[PDB]
mmCIF file of C-alpha atoms in Angstrom:
data_model
loop_
_atom_site.group_PDB
_atom_site.id
_atom_site.type_symbol
_atom_site.label_atom_id
_atom_site.label_comp_id
_atom_site.label_asym_id
_atom_site.label_seq_id
_atom_site.Cartn_x
_atom_site.Cartn_y
_atom_site.Cartn_z
ATOM 1 C CA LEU A 1 3.740 16.968 -14.245
ATOM 2 C CA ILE A 2 4.552 20.212 -16.111
ATOM 3 C CA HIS A 3 4.888 22.017 -12.811
ATOM 4 C CA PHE A 4 7.113 19.226 -11.583
ATOM 5 C CA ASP A 5 9.427 19.099 -14.623
ATOM 6 C CA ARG A 6 9.719 22.894 -14.451
ATOM 7 C CA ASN A 7 10.718 22.550 -10.796
ATOM 8 C CA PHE A 8 13.078 19.678 -11.366
ATOM 9 C CA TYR A 9 15.406 21.532 -13.745
ATOM 10 C CA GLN A 10 14.945 24.743 -11.675
ATOM 11 C CA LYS A 11 16.195 23.136 -8.487
ATOM 12 C CA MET A 12 18.442 20.277 -9.442
ATOM 13 C CA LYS A 13 20.346 21.009 -12.632
ATOM 14 C CA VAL A 14 23.138 23.604 -12.862
ATOM 15 C CA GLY A 15 24.140 25.165 -16.161
ATOM 16 C CA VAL A 16 21.498 27.442 -17.653
ATOM 17 C CA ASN A 17 18.920 25.834 -19.893
ATOM 18 C CA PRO A 18 21.128 23.981 -22.342
ATOM 19 C CA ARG A 19 19.084 20.783 -21.765
ATOM 20 C CA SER A 20 15.336 20.137 -22.061
ATOM 21 C CA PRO A 21 12.318 17.704 -21.972
ATOM 22 C CA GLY A 22 13.186 14.073 -21.894
ATOM 23 C CA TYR A 23 12.231 12.719 -18.513
ATOM 24 C CA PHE A 24 8.842 14.487 -19.001
ATOM 25 C CA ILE A 25 7.852 12.135 -21.819
ATOM 26 C CA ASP A 26 9.186 9.086 -19.903
ATOM 27 C CA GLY A 27 7.541 10.245 -16.697
ATOM 28 C CA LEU A 28 4.205 10.338 -18.529
ATOM 29 C CA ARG A 29 4.856 6.929 -20.106
ATOM 30 C CA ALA A 30 5.538 5.481 -16.667
ATOM 31 C CA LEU A 31 2.238 6.801 -15.206
ATOM 32 C CA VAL A 32 0.168 5.245 -17.968
ATOM 33 C CA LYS A 33 2.003 1.961 -17.498
ATOM 34 C CA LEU A 34 1.597 2.270 -13.708
ATOM 35 C CA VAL A 35 -2.077 3.237 -13.460
ATOM 36 C CA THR A 36 -3.031 0.406 -15.858
ATOM 37 C CA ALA A 37 -0.861 -1.962 -13.786
ATOM 38 C CA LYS A 38 -2.545 -0.758 -10.560
ATOM 39 C CA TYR A 39 -6.180 -0.457 -11.703
ATOM 40 C CA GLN A 40 -5.989 -4.015 -13.124
ATOM 41 C CA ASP A 41 -4.721 -5.100 -9.685
ATOM 42 C CA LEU A 42 -7.174 -2.945 -7.636
ATOM 43 C CA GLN A 43 -10.080 -4.484 -9.519
ATOM 44 C CA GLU A 44 -8.432 -7.902 -9.156
ATOM 45 C CA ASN A 45 -8.441 -7.696 -5.326
ATOM 46 C CA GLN A 46 -11.919 -6.089 -5.411
ATOM 47 C CA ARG A 47 -12.990 -9.148 -7.429
ATOM 48 C CA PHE A 48 -11.415 -11.382 -4.742
ATOM 49 C CA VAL A 49 -13.536 -9.724 -1.988
ATOM 50 C CA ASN A 50 -16.680 -9.726 -4.152
ATOM 51 C CA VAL A 51 -16.253 -13.478 -4.868
ATOM 52 C CA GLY A 52 -15.811 -13.972 -1.082
ATOM 53 C CA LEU A 53 -19.012 -11.974 -0.447
ATOM 54 C CA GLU A 54 -20.946 -14.351 -2.792
ATOM 55 C CA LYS A 55 -19.528 -17.366 -0.966
ATOM 56 C CA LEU A 56 -20.291 -16.242 2.640
ATOM 57 C CA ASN A 57 -23.929 -15.375 1.770
ATOM 58 C CA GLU A 58 -24.455 -18.862 0.290
ATOM 59 C CA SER A 59 -23.364 -20.495 3.610
ATOM 60 C CA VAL A 60 -25.598 -18.438 5.970
ATOM 61 C CA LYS A 61 -22.792 -19.728 12.043
ATOM 62 C CA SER A 62 -21.780 -18.084 15.383
ATOM 63 C CA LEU A 63 -18.672 -16.085 14.331
ATOM 64 C CA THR A 64 -19.174 -16.124 10.495
ATOM 65 C CA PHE A 65 -21.322 -12.972 10.544
ATOM 66 C CA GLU A 66 -18.256 -11.006 11.661
ATOM 67 C CA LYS A 67 -16.623 -12.114 8.361
ATOM 68 C CA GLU A 68 -19.734 -10.976 6.505
ATOM 69 C CA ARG A 69 -19.402 -7.636 8.292
ATOM 70 C CA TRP A 70 -16.252 -7.236 6.218
ATOM 71 C CA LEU A 71 -17.718 -4.315 4.366
ATOM 72 C CA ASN A 72 -15.086 -2.310 6.276
ATOM 73 C CA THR A 73 -12.685 -3.756 3.687
ATOM 74 C CA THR A 74 -15.330 -3.317 0.972
ATOM 75 C CA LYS A 75 -15.917 0.261 2.245
ATOM 76 C CA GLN A 76 -12.106 0.656 2.365
ATOM 77 C CA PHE A 77 -11.603 0.082 -1.386
ATOM 78 C CA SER A 78 -13.102 3.458 -2.403
ATOM 79 C CA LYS A 79 -10.516 5.339 -0.305
ATOM 80 C CA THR A 80 -7.714 3.121 -1.781
ATOM 81 C CA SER A 81 -8.842 3.845 -5.394
ATOM 82 C CA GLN A 82 -9.172 7.630 -4.728
ATOM 83 C CA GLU A 83 -5.464 7.901 -4.113
ATOM 84 C CA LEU A 84 -4.099 5.537 -6.864
ATOM 85 C CA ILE A 85 -4.004 8.268 -9.555
ATOM 86 C CA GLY A 86 -1.871 10.648 -7.478
ATOM 87 C CA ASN A 87 0.086 7.667 -5.979
ATOM 88 C CA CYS A 88 1.072 6.641 -9.448
ATOM 89 C CA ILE A 89 2.225 10.212 -10.130
ATOM 90 C CA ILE A 90 4.832 9.954 -7.324
ATOM 91 C CA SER A 91 5.836 6.418 -8.282
ATOM 92 C CA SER A 92 6.426 7.416 -11.899
ATOM 93 C CA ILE A 93 8.416 10.437 -10.938
ATOM 94 C CA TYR A 94 10.618 8.307 -8.615
ATOM 95 C CA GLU A 95 11.360 5.821 -11.403
ATOM 96 C CA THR A 96 12.142 8.536 -13.938
ATOM 97 C CA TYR A 97 13.500 11.681 -12.221
ATOM 98 C CA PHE A 98 14.932 10.363 -8.941
ATOM 99 C CA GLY A 99 17.200 7.482 -9.982
ATOM 100 C CA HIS A 100 20.307 9.687 -10.032
ATOM 101 C CA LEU A 101 19.484 12.045 -7.100
ATOM 102 C CA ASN A 102 20.910 12.287 -3.495
ATOM 103 C CA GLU A 103 19.197 10.916 -0.415
ATOM 104 C CA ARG A 104 18.275 14.504 0.468
ATOM 105 C CA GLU A 105 17.627 15.535 -3.127
ATOM 106 C CA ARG A 106 14.956 12.871 -3.504
ATOM 107 C CA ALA A 107 13.131 13.744 -0.277
ATOM 108 C CA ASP A 108 13.146 17.423 -1.064
ATOM 109 C CA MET A 109 11.633 17.004 -4.532
ATOM 110 C CA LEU A 110 9.025 14.742 -2.963
ATOM 111 C CA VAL A 111 7.987 17.710 -0.804
ATOM 112 C CA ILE A 112 7.602 19.928 -3.842
ATOM 113 C CA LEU A 113 5.714 17.156 -5.577
ATOM 114 C CA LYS A 114 3.434 16.480 -2.579
ATOM 115 C CA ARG A 115 2.655 20.163 -2.088
ATOM 116 C CA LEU A 116 1.912 20.320 -5.831
ATOM 117 C CA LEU A 117 -0.358 17.329 -5.259
ATOM 118 C CA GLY A 118 -1.749 19.425 -2.384
ATOM 119 C CA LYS A 119 -2.798 22.375 -4.560
ATOM 120 C CA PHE A 120 -4.375 20.131 -7.181
ATOM 121 C CA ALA A 121 -7.586 18.234 -6.526
ATOM 122 C CA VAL A 122 -5.592 15.009 -6.418
ATOM 123 C CA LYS A 123 -5.645 12.631 -3.479
ATOM 124 C CA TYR A 124 -2.484 10.855 -2.402
ATOM 125 C CA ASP A 125 -1.510 8.523 0.481
ATOM 126 C CA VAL A 126 -0.136 10.709 3.261
ATOM 127 C CA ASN A 127 1.694 7.778 4.856
ATOM 128 C CA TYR A 128 3.439 6.797 1.567
ATOM 129 C CA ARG A 129 6.612 4.763 0.981
ATOM 130 C CA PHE A 130 8.134 4.132 -2.458
ATOM 131 C CA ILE A 131 9.759 0.859 -1.476
ATOM 132 C CA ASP A 132 6.631 -0.793 0.025
ATOM 133 C CA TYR A 133 4.427 0.593 -2.740
ATOM 134 C CA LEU A 134 6.239 -0.938 -5.695
ATOM 135 C CA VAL A 135 8.464 -3.646 -4.185
ATOM 136 C CA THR A 136 7.004 -7.087 -3.632
ATOM 137 C CA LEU A 137 8.265 -9.122 -0.648
ATOM 138 C CA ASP A 138 9.251 -11.970 -3.004
ATOM 139 C CA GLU A 139 11.438 -9.511 -4.990
ATOM 140 C CA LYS A 140 12.657 -7.727 -1.845
ATOM 141 C CA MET A 141 13.929 -11.146 -0.646
ATOM 142 C CA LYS A 142 15.426 -12.000 -4.041
ATOM 143 C CA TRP A 143 17.568 -8.884 -4.270
ATOM 144 C CA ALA B 1 15.677 2.092 21.934
ATOM 145 C CA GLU B 2 12.035 1.111 22.368
ATOM 146 C CA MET B 3 10.768 2.933 19.323
ATOM 147 C CA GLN B 4 13.600 2.054 16.928
ATOM 148 C CA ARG B 5 13.012 -1.637 17.821
ATOM 149 C CA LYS B 6 9.279 -1.204 17.144
ATOM 150 C CA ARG B 7 9.929 0.664 13.885
ATOM 151 C CA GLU B 8 11.287 -2.505 12.221
ATOM 152 C CA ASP B 9 8.352 -4.750 13.282
ATOM 153 C CA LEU B 10 5.849 -1.953 12.464
ATOM 154 C CA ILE B 11 6.345 -2.213 8.711
ATOM 155 C CA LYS B 12 7.375 -5.911 9.026
ATOM 156 C CA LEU B 13 4.133 -7.105 10.694
ATOM 157 C CA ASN B 14 2.285 -4.638 8.410
ATOM 158 C CA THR B 15 3.451 -6.638 5.372
ATOM 159 C CA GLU B 16 3.671 -10.057 7.147
ATOM 160 C CA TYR B 17 0.128 -10.057 8.566
ATOM 161 C CA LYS B 18 -1.323 -8.671 5.342
ATOM 162 C CA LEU B 19 0.497 -11.437 3.441
ATOM 163 C CA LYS B 20 -0.832 -13.853 6.118
ATOM 164 C CA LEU B 21 -4.278 -12.277 5.609
ATOM 165 C CA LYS B 22 -3.970 -13.113 1.879
ATOM 166 C CA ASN B 23 -2.426 -16.497 2.795
ATOM 167 C CA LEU B 24 -5.196 -17.510 5.222
ATOM 168 C CA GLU B 25 -8.046 -16.280 2.927
ATOM 169 C CA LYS B 26 -6.723 -18.727 0.303
ATOM 170 C CA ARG B 27 -6.448 -21.620 2.851
ATOM 171 C CA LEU B 28 -10.043 -20.980 3.936
ATOM 172 C CA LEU B 29 -11.559 -20.992 0.420
ATOM 173 C CA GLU B 30 -9.675 -24.187 -0.633
ATOM 174 C CA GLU B 31 -11.239 -26.222 2.206
ATOM 175 C CA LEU B 32 -14.671 -24.516 1.959
ATOM 176 C CA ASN B 33 -14.960 -25.830 -1.637
ATOM 177 C CA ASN B 34 -13.672 -29.312 -0.705
ATOM 178 C CA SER B 35 -15.682 -29.809 2.521
ATOM 179 C CA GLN B 36 -19.017 -28.144 1.600
ATOM 180 C CA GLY B 37 -20.902 -31.429 1.118
ATOM 181 C CA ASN B 38 -18.633 -33.066 3.716
ATOM 182 C CA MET B 39 -18.676 -32.498 7.490
ATOM 183 C CA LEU B 40 -17.456 -29.350 9.197
ATOM 184 C CA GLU B 41 -13.751 -29.874 8.526
ATOM 185 C CA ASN B 42 -13.694 -26.116 7.854
ATOM 186 C CA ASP B 43 -14.075 -25.966 11.664
ATOM 187 C CA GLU B 44 -10.512 -27.299 12.017
ATOM 188 C CA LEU B 45 -9.410 -24.255 9.990
ATOM 189 C CA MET B 46 -12.018 -22.087 11.742
ATOM 190 C CA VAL B 47 -10.257 -22.473 15.129
ATOM 191 C CA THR B 48 -7.253 -21.157 13.169
ATOM 192 C CA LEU B 49 -9.660 -18.488 11.864
ATOM 193 C CA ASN B 50 -10.627 -17.910 15.507
ATOM 194 C CA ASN B 51 -6.909 -17.254 15.980
ATOM 195 C CA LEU B 52 -7.252 -14.929 12.961
ATOM 196 C CA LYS B 53 -9.624 -12.757 15.078
ATOM 197 C CA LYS B 54 -6.419 -11.755 16.885
ATOM 198 C CA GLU B 55 -4.593 -11.448 13.529
ATOM 199 C CA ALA B 56 -7.194 -9.398 11.623
ATOM 200 C CA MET B 57 -7.556 -7.148 14.639
ATOM 201 C CA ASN B 58 -3.799 -7.241 15.402
ATOM 202 C CA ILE B 59 -3.493 -5.191 12.214
ATOM 203 C CA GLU B 60 -6.063 -2.791 13.523
ATOM 204 C CA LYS B 61 -4.226 -2.701 16.871
ATOM 205 C CA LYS B 62 -0.979 -1.780 15.193
ATOM 206 C CA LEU B 63 -2.465 0.709 12.694
ATOM 207 C CA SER B 64 -4.008 2.579 15.634
ATOM 208 C CA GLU B 65 -0.675 2.945 17.421
ATOM 209 C CA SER B 66 0.991 3.852 14.090
ATOM 210 C CA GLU B 67 -0.928 7.116 13.860
ATOM 211 C CA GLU B 68 0.602 7.766 17.284
ATOM 212 C CA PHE B 69 4.150 6.499 16.425
ATOM 213 C CA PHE B 70 4.739 8.274 13.116
ATOM 214 C CA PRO B 71 4.249 11.863 14.361
ATOM 215 C CA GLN B 72 6.631 11.052 17.261
ATOM 216 C CA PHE B 73 9.157 9.581 14.823
ATOM 217 C CA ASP B 74 9.052 12.763 12.740
ATOM 218 C CA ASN B 75 9.576 14.824 15.898
ATOM 219 C CA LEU B 76 12.773 12.875 16.596
ATOM 220 C CA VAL B 77 14.185 13.386 13.105
ATOM 221 C CA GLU B 78 14.741 17.085 13.848
ATOM 222 C CA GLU B 79 17.179 16.843 16.752
#
């Protein structure tokens, strides 16, 4: 986040260092609010597949053991949770630093962010999309 | 034209089927709790869950061709 803020002013802003840390604080405050929003919802859907695992085992019939074999989804959760920390990083930065940038200016910072996420031992979703990640289809309709 | 048409339904049926996956999981558990001491009514939703074997695996069908579509999309952005 330090290496991103240092790169944001370095690339984007013109006029030499009159202005300083603001977004940085708000970018951090977004991440905390976003990880807590996402980990409460990761564990909520993990609780919905664990309560469905309890209910299928109670029943057991011809095709139902395919549903039981839904440890692919249960196996899938670990990979999903591995990336949520670094996924929240990008989401927070988009909400805070990107709002007033150009189509191209957003994309390009994303590159610098992702390659910063690449150096660090942080895992992010390679096929990532800001819209789909934080917009809900009920809100996407509403707007 | 073929891939720009499939680009829209790619992320559409991504969200639609996953919202239908969350929608049909809920429809299944509502009747499983109502019909458990009753007859196999669940069966009347299980033929719809037999249709879901196309839907659950439709997702898997489309995710497999996505890993093929995306790198071709990004090749076309350059020209």
